[PDB]
Every structure is written in C-alpha cells, then in structure tokens.
Amino acid sequence: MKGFAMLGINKLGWIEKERPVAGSYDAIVRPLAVSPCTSDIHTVFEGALGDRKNMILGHEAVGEVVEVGSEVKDFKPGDRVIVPCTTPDWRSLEVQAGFQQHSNGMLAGWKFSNFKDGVFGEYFHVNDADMNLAILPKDMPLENAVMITDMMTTGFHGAELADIQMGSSVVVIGIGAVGLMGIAGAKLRGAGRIIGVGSRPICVEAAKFYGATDILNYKNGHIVDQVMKLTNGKGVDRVIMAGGGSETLSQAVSMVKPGGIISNINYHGSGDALLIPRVEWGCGMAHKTIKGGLCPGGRLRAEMLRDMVVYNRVDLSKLVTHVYHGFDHIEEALLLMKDKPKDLIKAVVIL
Amino acid sequence: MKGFAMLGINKLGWIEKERPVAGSYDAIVRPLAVSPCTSDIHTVFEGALGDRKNMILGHEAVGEVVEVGSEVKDFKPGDRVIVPCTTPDWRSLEVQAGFQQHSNGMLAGWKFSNFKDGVFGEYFHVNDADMNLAILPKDMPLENAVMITDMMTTGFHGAELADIQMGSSVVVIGIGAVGLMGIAGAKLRGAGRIIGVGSRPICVEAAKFYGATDILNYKNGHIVDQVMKLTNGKGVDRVIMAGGGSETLSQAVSMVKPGGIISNINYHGSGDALLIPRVEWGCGMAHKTIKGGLCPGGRLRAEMLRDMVVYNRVDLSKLVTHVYHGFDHIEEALLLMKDKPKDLIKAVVIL
Amino acid sequence: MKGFAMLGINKLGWIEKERPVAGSYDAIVRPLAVSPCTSDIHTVFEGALGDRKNMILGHEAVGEVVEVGSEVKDFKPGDRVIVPCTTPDWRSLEVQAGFQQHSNGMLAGWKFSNFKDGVFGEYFHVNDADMNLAILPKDMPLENAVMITDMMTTGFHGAELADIQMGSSVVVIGIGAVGLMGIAGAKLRGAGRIIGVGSRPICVEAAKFYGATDILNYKNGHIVDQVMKLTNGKGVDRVIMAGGGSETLSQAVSMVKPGGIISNINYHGSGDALLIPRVEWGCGMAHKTIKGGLCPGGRLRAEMLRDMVVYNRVDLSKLVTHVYHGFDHIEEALLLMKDKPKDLIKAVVIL
Amino acid sequence: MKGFAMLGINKLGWIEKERPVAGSYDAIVRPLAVSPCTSDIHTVFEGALGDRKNMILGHEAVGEVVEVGSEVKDFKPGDRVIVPCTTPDWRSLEVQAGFQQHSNGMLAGWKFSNFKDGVFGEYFHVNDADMNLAILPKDMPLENAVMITDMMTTGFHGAELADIQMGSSVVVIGIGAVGLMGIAGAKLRGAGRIIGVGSRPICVEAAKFYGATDILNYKNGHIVDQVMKLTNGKGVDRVIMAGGGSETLSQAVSMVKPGGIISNINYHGSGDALLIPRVEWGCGMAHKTIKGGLCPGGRLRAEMLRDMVVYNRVDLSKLVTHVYHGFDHIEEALLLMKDKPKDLIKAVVIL
Numbered sequence A, B, C, D: 001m002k003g004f005a006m007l008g009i010n011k012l013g014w015i016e017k018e019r020p021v022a023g024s025y026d027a028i029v030r031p032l033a034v035s036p037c038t039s040d041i042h043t044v045f046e047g048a049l050g051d052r053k054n055m056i057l058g059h060e061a062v063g064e065v066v067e068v069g070s071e072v073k074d075f076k077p078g079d080r081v082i083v084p085c086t087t088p089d090w091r092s093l094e095v096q097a098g099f100q101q102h103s104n105g106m107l108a109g110w111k112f113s114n115f116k117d118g119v120f121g122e123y124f125h126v127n128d129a130d131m132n133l134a135i136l137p138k139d140m141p142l143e144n145a146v147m148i149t150d151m152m153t154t155g156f157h158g159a160e161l162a163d164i165q166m167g168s169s170v171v172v173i174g175i176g177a178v179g180l181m182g183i184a185g186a187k188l189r190g191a192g193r194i195i196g197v198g199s200r201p202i203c204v205e206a207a208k209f210y211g212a213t214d215i216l217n218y219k220n221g222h223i224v225d226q227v228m229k230l231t232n233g234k235g236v237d238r239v240i241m242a243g244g245g246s247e248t249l250s251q252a253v254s255m256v257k258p259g260g261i262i263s264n265i266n267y268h269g270s271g272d273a274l275l276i277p278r279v280e281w282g283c284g285m286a287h288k289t290i291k292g293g294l295c296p297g298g299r300l301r302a303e304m305l306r307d308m309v310v311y312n313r314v315d316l317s318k319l320v321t322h323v324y325h326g327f328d329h330i331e332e333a334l335l336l337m338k339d340k341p342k343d344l345i346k347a348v349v350i351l
C-alpha cells in the first residue's frame, strides 16, 4: 500500500507500507476526499509531536467502508461515511467522568497522524466502527462534508465552552477556518455584537458572512485599546481565542468584563509558558474564567452536526477555496498549506 | 385623568383618577404606543387573578418620560424609552437569591395590570426608573419596539430554560405570538430539527419563517403519535409549552426522551391542577426535568434584547398584523384578543 | 444452580436454572452478602414494571469473582468486589449524551431484577467487568458495603439533583433508608435547616443522627400548615420526595418557595398520574423546578462512593437493623420489606 | 471621632475623623468586636491596592446600631448586628447580571478598607441597612460571629467555585484561616480525599479537624512529585489555591487531571503576571478550567451562613487563637498578622 508520510523531521515523501488489519470491532476505510490541516504542517516542520519515522499524515476525511470486523453491527462494506477527527476508546474511566477527548490519556482521543497512520494512504484504520462513524447523506457535496470532521466541531466547541447568553457581546481572536466557525457558533448561541480580529481579505469577507458585526486589524494598533474605543471603555462579555501567539491570553483577560468567560481552541506550540496579567485579572478575584479544549468526536457529535448542515443552520461551502481531483494531488495540496498563499482558507482533494 | 380599567370581575370601564406622583426614585411616563395581551382577558373575564377594584389595564408600551424624582440620574424629561412588562423591586431578598421575577412575593415583580394601574391611561407610574427603563433607538419602528416588552422576552426565556444543545431536536406546542418567539429563540440556541404545533394559516407561515422545519395540526390527531411517526419512534430532545390547556403537560412528557427537558411559559388561568403521566414519566426516574416561569424584566434584559434587534438577529415585524391610531381605539383592540379573528397575531395602538 | 425468583405477579419461589456463561469482557460472580429492596415489592405485588416469569430477584450485593473472559484485564478469579445496582452498556449513544442510566432504553442501565436475573442466586452475570466492578476494601464490613450499591447512591443523587446552596432550608418527605441517605446527602452539600417527615421511632432517631434539625409527624394534620407555622409563613428552599403516595407532590409544591427545586427519588408504582396544584404553582410561572431520576452506577461511581466511606464521610452502619446468616433466609428477609415491622430500616443476609 | 488608619505606604497610626452621618437608607454602627486581615498587610506594606492616605482600616466586625435613616424599616437603635465584609450597592447592572461582588466596578462590592473608611473606628457607616445587615443571635460568642464576616464566606466560596463532586479528590494549597475554611467547605460539598499543603503545627492540626486526610510539606522536595507518588502518577480532580506565591498556579496545573478545575481565592499582591506551563496545560487543550473570585456579601448571605453556625454545621471557635480586650489593642493585633507567630491563625479584639 502506498501513502504520503513524514520520513522524518523536516522530510516527507511517498512510501510503501503494509495494509492494516481490522479487529473484531474495527473497520478499514478508503478515502473519497481528504483535506490537509495546519497541525500536519506543525508536526513535520516544527516537531510539535516529537520524532516520527515513516508515519502517514492527515486526519480529515470522508470515505467508503471496505472491510468490517465480526462484531460490527451498524456498518458494512459499501457504506459512505463521515469520520470525526477525534475517535476515542469509549470504554474508559475518563469517559465515565464526562471527558471523551482524554480517554486513556491527555488528548488520547486524537489518533490519526499522532500514534496511528493517518488518512493520506490508499486505506486507513478506524477503531470501534459502531461508536465512531456516521452515515454520509447522498446529496451532500464531499467538499462540504470534510469540513465537519474538524473545522465545524472545533469552532462550535469554542462557542459552547464560552457559555454565551442572549445579547452577549463577543470577540473572536483569529479568523482562519477555525475562527470563522467560532463566529458562526457564537451567532448560533444568541450573541449580539461579534467582533472579529484578523487581516487577510479573503478571511475578512468570510467573517462578515458568518456573523461579524465589527472587524479589527491587529497590525493597525494595540488590539485591546481598539476594543475599548468600540465599547466606550466597557469591554465585552465573552472572548474566543482561535489564532495568534501565546500573548493573546493576556489580551483576552484585559478586554473581558469582570464575571466574563475566555474560551481557547488554539493549539499553542512555542515557548515554555503563557502569562496572565495580575492587575487586569483583578488579582485573581474578578470572576474571569479561563477554559480550553480539544474538539469532541464520536458518532453522536458527528450526527448532530450533520443534521445542522442538513437543516441549513450553517453554510460550509465558504471555507473551501481550492479543489483538486486525483490521488496524487495529496502532495501538491499539503505544499499549498505550507506556503500559505493569501487566497487560501482550506483545500480539498477528491480522489 | 382617564384610563381604561377593570371595575370588578367581568366589568370594564373608563374611570377618573388622580394623576400619579413620582417618589424620589420614580418616573411618570405618557404612552406613545401600546398593545393588548391575552393575559388581561384571563384576569378580567375569568378572574384568574382574583377580585380587583377599579384597576387600569395594560402592560406593553413604549413612551416618553414626563417627570422624574430628585434621585433619578440616567433619565430626564423628554427621553424616549422601552418599558419592560416586569419592573422588579431590586432591593429585596428574592433578588439577592437570584430571582428578580419574585421580588417581595410570588410574581410580584410584574406589577402593571396585576395589582398596579397599567399603561392604558393618559399617564402611568414606573418604579425605579434608573433600574427599570431602556432608551429607544432613533430609527426603530414603534410597533416593533413594543414586541420586546413582553413577547420577545417571554418566548426567548422559554428557549433559555430548555437548555438547548447544538443539533438538539425541539417541539414547540402553540404557535401564537409567544410560541413564534419560542421557535426563533430555539434556532438561536443551535437547535437542529424544530417542529411547530398549531393551525392558524398566518401563524403557520410565520413559524416557518422563524425556523420551523415541520408543522403539525393538533386537530388531525393526538400530537404524541404524530411526533413519534416523524421521528421513527425516537421522540425529541426538548419541548416548549406555549399554548393550549392543562393537558399539554402530559403530551410533552410522552414525546420527550429520557434525560430531556420541558419548558413552560404558558399562563394557565383555569382548572384545579395539571397531571403528570406516571408510566411515561418513568415512574419519576426518567430524568425528564419540568420547568416554568415568568419572563425576566428590568433594564439589562431590555438593553440586551434591544441590541439583538439592532444587529438583525431577529425580525420582529412579522408579529404585528393590526395597527390602530388614536387613544380611543384601546377598548376595541382589547376585544380582538378575546374574539381572535383568524388573521390576528398582535395589534398596536399608536396614540 | 438455584435462585429465589418472581414466578409472576404476586408469585415468589425458588427455581432451578442454568449457570450463566461469560463472554470475552464479562465475569461470573458468586454472592457473599445481599439485601432486599422495596422496589422488588412494587415489581412483584404492584406489577408496576410489566409482566415477568422466572426472573431471579435482588440488586444489592458484594461477591467473589469466579471466572473472567479472555479480554478482561483488571480482574481475575479470587477478587472480592462491590457491585453497583446500575451496570450500563458503555458503548451506547445515551452514554455519549451523558445519561448512563438509560443506555439502550429508559432505565436500561439498571438490569438486575428489572429485566435480568438478579443477585439472589448461587451465581450471577456482570456485563463488562473492567467497566462495571470495584474492589472491596480489605477491612470493610460486608453489611456496610452492601448499603453502597443502592441506598447511598440513590439518596445522594436526590441531594445532587436538588442543587443545594450552603445555608439552604430543606424538607425531606419520608425517612426510610432512602430518605435517611437523602438527609445525609443534603448535609454533605451544605444545607442549614433540615425538616424530616415520618413516624417510626427507629427512623426518627436515625434522621436526627444524619442531620435533621426538626421532625414532623404526618398523622397530626395538614403537613403544609405545620411547615408554614414552623417557618413563620415563608416556606422552604428545597424539597426531596423519598416516600409516600402521589399526593406528596402537591404538598411539596405548596411548601417550596418561588424559585425553589423539588427532587424526586421515590419510585412511584401505583395510580395513573401525579397532580400539580395550579394556584400554588403560580399558574406555571413560579420557577418551581421539578426533577426525578434513577441512581447512577458503573465502576467510577462505586469507587468514588467507596472512598467516601473509607474517609469516614458517612456512617452506613446505622441503616442495617437485621442480619441473617445463610442462603435460605432471603425469603423471610424480603417479606419484612412488605409488612414493615416498627424496628426495621434495612436487612442483610450473609452467606 | 478617632480611628486606626493608613497614614501612607508603610505607615500606621490613630487619627481624627468627622463622625459619619446616615442617609435615608443608611445606618451608623459602633463596633463591639473586630479582627485584622492579611489583606490589610498587602495594601499598607505592599502598596497592592494603589496608594491611600488617611484611610481607616478593617473590614471584619460585629456591632450595635446607634442611628438609622428615615427610610430604614427593619433595624432600629439598640439592635445588635453582624456586618458582612462585602456590602454591595443592590441597584446596579452587575447585580442584574448576577455579580454582586462587582456592583459599579471591579471588586467594588468590597468597600471597607478598599476605598471607604473601615471598621477600626468609634463609629462606621453601612450603606443600605435593610439590605446589608443581619441580626446577631443573643447567645452567640462575639469572637465566633466575626469569623462569618470574611473567613467563612471566602473559604466556602473556594469550594463552591470548584464545583466539587461527591467523592472527588481535592488538594488545598495553603492552610491558614482562608485555607482552613476551604477544607471545611470542600467536606461540606462531598469531597473524598483532601490533601492539605502547609507546615505550621497549629494549622496542621486544625486542618485535620476540618477534614484533611493527607498533609504535605515543601521540605520533601517537588510538591508535584510528592502528589504524584501519593496518587500513583494519576493526579487529583480539584485544586483550591488559598495561599502562597504566584508560582502555585504552575503547580496546580501540573497536578490536576485533564478535565479538572482549579479554584483561586488567594488575593495575589505582587508581581507582573502568573505563569501557566504550556506542555502541562496540554497546550491549552486539556480542559483544565481556571477560576477565581471575591467572596459574596449582603443580608441573605450573612443570614444563611449565620444559620449554618446555629445548626452546628461548622465550629468557628478553632480559628480564634488570640483574644484582646480594649479598643487600643488593634495596633498590636494588626502587627501580629505581619509577624506571623507560629501559634497564630486569627485574633479578635473585644471593645
């Protein structure tokens, strides 16, 4: 079997690996459409995961089931499915506590291109098919469906953790794919004023489409001061961190009102720590709560998000800017994510 | 001054009273636009409230401040304001416990036409102006603004008490003005499938506009069976009670699944009591939570909802079907809320 | 093997049955100590559950592991174990939604004596050993340990659902074993004044020991009037329903304050419906929330409650009033729960 | 009138002030018993809360009403009362939002020795008597009653914000007065294992009395490694920060499990920021929530805590180690808080 893998730190190329076997409760799937992610780039060129030798990359896909284990009861070869990027082991004490994302370990719910070969191969492995897969509606465009697996679930989780009320004012820092879904999520929770922060034109138009009432360019002046001008020195009720450096935490604390909430969905990968400004945090007594976490996965989450798309609660087509046709294009696509052209949001490869 | 009032149970009439005087923290306001509510019909022609002696009616209005006490600091004579139907006494133990709606007594937060002279007069009295009033936006249409004072705040409250999740299925029983706002609120909390119950043609079209994906007519058969057929026998996640008789409670319990929530915003003005079906309620162990409460009021609630309108999160114009001009039309308007002509939702009298 | 079973509605007797076999993830356990429950009396004599035939009874036990499947990793033959009355199927959609108690159906988390052969037999089956068992501490008395499997988990759950604030006034209707654990749980959540309702002397003493500050006898007149006089006409903050007929719901509604919460842990197995008094419920606008649910189970719940006992947070010995030695005493012990002698609370049979 | 005040940074001494006069809703009270706080030390000798001049210190007291405004209805001259350290302005928007502690500004609910003359004077002013005072029980020792005003409300708030589960493992960093009430509060919320961190002998014994199951000291090396050895390398469910430097946030993050909560009640007096270790915080994706807030106040809170003491839920006498007689001893008492003698916890001065 051939697939696109990380040969080592800073090196990637096509390799030959043996096709994975399926256990009694597993399923083997072949990709129909895939999409490169920002995290893939960070593991290869930044060593954000350690040293990996010959590991196939990727964690965002939709495909066809080609083989199932003896105990699989809800799926069979031929089924077209949506695969959530987070596929946890449902039999754990962490699950009994209410935290699927950390089943058997911190972030252990994230398997593809971490401690298991990714989806950028002729075939890939899915653990516990009945608990980690959802059926793909026949009339749903493949491009749009791939956006559910990670972008939609991550951004919407940001709005959920933020505990938004009807009429609350919100600020979203970073307007890339994840940030754009954070804006959409906030509107879908009843937010009044929504302020997006970014600079790339293509992202700015998308931000307004999803619900942004105000746009701020961080390169044109201290972002905190800009927020105060807009709110007449009052601040905002909630803040969502979706992009930028570790210093965005300090900015968030300075703009939120006493009693407000800060929600992080950005994976920080540089430096030794993040800092909380003491005075602005009311010396630790201003009731300014800080939250953050990996997107939830599994079958239920996938089906609920799918239905929202079916009932037109959100239009996912705006996130996809580049579409390719043919297995070999997986290479050209990942390269596109590395160079970050100004006209790019997300790219999908249809096999 | 003159004012339309309830002389006694089943008797209405115009009486001559002394113009109200404001205390140190109060304000006297003259109405600009008002609207009749079905709640007053219950209290008067069915004595659902009790026996009253010469009490002026009405609780939904937009007006102009005329006089203020020596201690009022944020409002002055000539200001245009939005008056919330619930005007709590903020200096009470109930407020300290977190329940403004019951300051100094069960339902006491709501004063107009409950036990205090209402808005259907040349002038009326508002307690604690600085804590219970909100400025009316310059470009905002009067008819629309009146819908915030009661309909919007009650409907959204139903969606808030329901604790809706992203992708949850919801059923709204009763599609009158209040129910329509319940549908709009549910969509704005992330609901997936939304099923509306009613029959009036004008109310049905409005329901779809606000977000309903399915419509059911209770006259065609038992609604529980209808819902089960639509959901292949699964039932729904949430239920909002916005209309009908006491028997609607039993229906909600039967259609909601284990662990779901039932939210009541309907004002039951008759009957000795409501029933909960033992078997369907899982003998009291199915985790089917039942909630119910009076709509929130005060300045903050008014400002937060106002801003949602300003940011186009919801279009209130679809609620106003009838508009009159001239103070004397008040009596005629209140009668319509009793007659209920098939093409009516809410009516406003612009003075 | 033999086991004490329900032959049919109003029928009890010992039967001969085949010893259960274990699957790859199961375990076969032999009982060391068991206890009878009032729920079994509702099932057998009240038929409040449906029809059953030759179903072994009992759901409260501690035992020894005899055999385990090939995939069981944390348990082996020879281990002493605490078995929760609720043993869910962790691989289900209800679990993904946060309601283990209803995995694969309403109340489906509770299997023993509900629809699966109970613990009153020479051996019994436990589904998913690693996920549904807990090790019994070396020096823990068998009689005390049994109280954890149901009484402790149910009573505490009533206090948990009540969302008690520090200093809240509480009324516990019914002072049997479940109500006694409800009083203890309420105290362990920060309650101030705790009023218990009952009559049996032995229970009255236990109520005081667990935290009750006031005791009221329901056979002395209108219980609501009694409560009002004690509270100078103010009412109480919370109410936990743990005993009595369906009319206790009306009483709870009348004595609870607007904005309060009513928590039901009483398994109602008689009648058609429970009544909610219209006027006292503020016509459905008093924010008087009503909850009710089955007790949680699984390995995590058992281990957590176990540790609470080990750290002396609660003394379970006061619940066990009768102790027998020998399998044959199961029949007599169960009958006691039907007739209820004046000096009984709970009984345990050690094999 | 005379009082003990802060002359300037690092300066303390008695001065003369005009006798405070009451407004319509206010009351003038003379102290009967008071106590010094570590907060006062951070303001005077650390210039934490900016620079103050001639401000009377103190915020913990019990006293007698000597004068009331024309509008006061529940309190009269001669009444003995309990005064909560937090006395919020109930007519504010923050109160409408559910945050009394920040009425009219960040931390503005706390007035005494923050920006208003404290209780260390012959007479002091209490805003809104009917909403901010509680009657002192006839037979309640003055020393005990003063511990309600701040220590009890603060420690218990740490437990409340921590959202403790029945059986949760908890670690309390800092075992002084506040940390002691933190341990007591956690037990009254159902905690199982409670590990305290401190070394002072008198505190170590009081900690065990309140509920601590394990005690750790810094001499043994890395506090994290110690916690890991005790927990088999698993960590704990919750962490309450009650004392120590800002580096304790880092320790809390490293010892808490993914999905846990960190609760801060420690008033951090110096430093630019608090540091969060990137890797241990799971790059901000491990769901480790961070909270922190000022203690609640007002009439309801005071009465509720008062009743918890009346019903013997907590014994406050263990906090008072030093008792002085005569107004003049305030200076000596306040100095002890700075010196920190090995046998001190709290000191009370009776007039």
Ligand SMILES: NC(=O)C1=CN([C@@H]2O[C@H](COP(=O)(O)OP(=O)(O)OC[C@H]3O[C@@H](n4cnc5c(N)ncnc54)[C@@H](OP(=O)(O)O)[C@@H]3O)[C@@H](O)[C@H]2O)C=CC1
Residues within 6 Å of the ligand: B037, B038, B039, B085, B110, B150, B151, B154, B173, B174, B175, B176, B177, B178, B179, B197, B198, B199, B200, B203, B218, B242, B243, B244, B245, B248, B265, B266, B267, B268, B295
């Ligand atoms: N006190 C306060 O501040 C306020 C309280 N409330 C209360 O909320 C409630 C809703 O008022 P409103 O919106 O004016 O209601 P309406 O009287 O206009 O009727 C609402 C709906 O109930 C339906 N309905 C009738 N019978 C049934 C049935 N048997 N089964 C299912 N549905 C049925 C409808 O059917 P159809 O289409 O046939 O008419 C109609 O769409 C009222 O009781 C009101 O007092 C609302 C606002 C304020």
Ligand SMILES: NC(=O)C1=CN([C@@H]2O[C@H](COP(=O)(O)OP(=O)(O)OC[C@H]3O[C@@H](n4cnc5c(N)ncnc54)[C@H](OP(=O)(O)O)[C@@H]3O)[C@@H](O)[C@H]2O)C=CC1
Residues within 6 Å of the ligand: C037, C038, C039, C042, C085, C110, C150, C151, C154, C173, C174, C175, C176, C177, C178, C179, C197, C198, C199, C200, C203, C218, C242, C243, C244, C245, C248, C265, C266, C267, C268, C295
């Ligand atoms: N399915 C499950 O897993 C379980 C369900 N449950 C359920 O919870 C409930 C409680 O069980 P248990 O504690 O064993 O009950 P008991 O049979 O011991 O009775 C408890 C109390 O109810 C009383 N009572 C009777 N009538 C009234 C009344 N009119 N008003 C007030 N109190 C009254 C008592 O009075 P007196 O003092 O005179 O007897 C007694 O104090 C039962 O339904 C049981 O099935 C409990 C455990 C498990």
Ligand SMILES: NC(=O)C1=CN([C@@H]2O[C@H](COP(=O)(O)OP(=O)(O)OC[C@H]3O[C@H](n4cnc5c(N)ncnc54)[C@@H](OP(=O)(O)O)[C@@H]3O)[C@@H](O)[C@H]2O)C=CC1
Residues within 6 Å of the ligand: A037, A038, A039, A085, A110, A150, A151, A154, A173, A174, A175, A176, A177, A178, A179, A197, A198, A199, A200, A203, A218, A242, A243, A244, A245, A248, A265, A266, A267, A268, A295
């Ligand atoms: N592990 C998982 O399963 C996943 C984790 N995540 C994580 O969430 C995060 C967001 O990813 P993605 O949406 O692809 O983001 P992008 O890389 O496209 O960038 C988003 C934003 O960051 C910007 N930015 C840079 N500096 C600042 C600044 N100083 N202030 C404000 N904004 C700034 C933007 O400006 P400009 O317009 O100039 O670029 C841009 O709008 C990433 O860390 C990602 O790994 C996301 C998906 C999956």
Ligand SMILES: NC(=O)C1=CN([C@@H]2O[C@H](COP(=O)(O)OP(=O)(O)OC[C@H]3O[C@H](n4cnc5c(N)ncnc54)[C@@H](OP(=O)(O)O)[C@@H]3O)[C@@H](O)[C@H]2O)C=CC1
Residues within 6 Å of the ligand: D037, D038, D039, D085, D110, D150, D151, D154, D173, D174, D175, D176, D177, D178, D179, D197, D198, D199, D200, D203, D242, D243, D244, D245, D248, D265, D266, D267, D268, D295
């Ligand atoms: N503003 C308000 O209304 C109030 C604010 N607060 C605040 O809460 C916080 C606590 O006061 P309180 O508990 O009375 O204070 P204390 O000064 O008595 O000290 C408490 C603990 O801190 C210790 N300690 C020192 N360094 C460390 C460390 N590095 N790690 C762990 N523990 C350490 C202790 O050790 P040892 O045992 O060796 O002494 C002691 O047990 C203070 O900042 C205070 O201002 C409290 C009340 C009111």
Ligand SMILES: [Zn+2]
Residues within 6 Å of the ligand: A037, A038, A039, A059, A060, A085, A150
């Ligand atoms: Zn991704």
Ligand SMILES: [Zn+2]
Residues within 6 Å of the ligand: B037, B038, B039, B059, B085, B150
């Ligand atoms: Zn109304």
Ligand SMILES: [Zn+2]
Residues within 6 Å of the ligand: C037, C038, C039, C059, C085, C150
């Ligand atoms: Zn039972």
Ligand SMILES: [Zn+2]
Residues within 6 Å of the ligand: D037, D038, D039, D059, D150
């Ligand atoms: Zn203090």
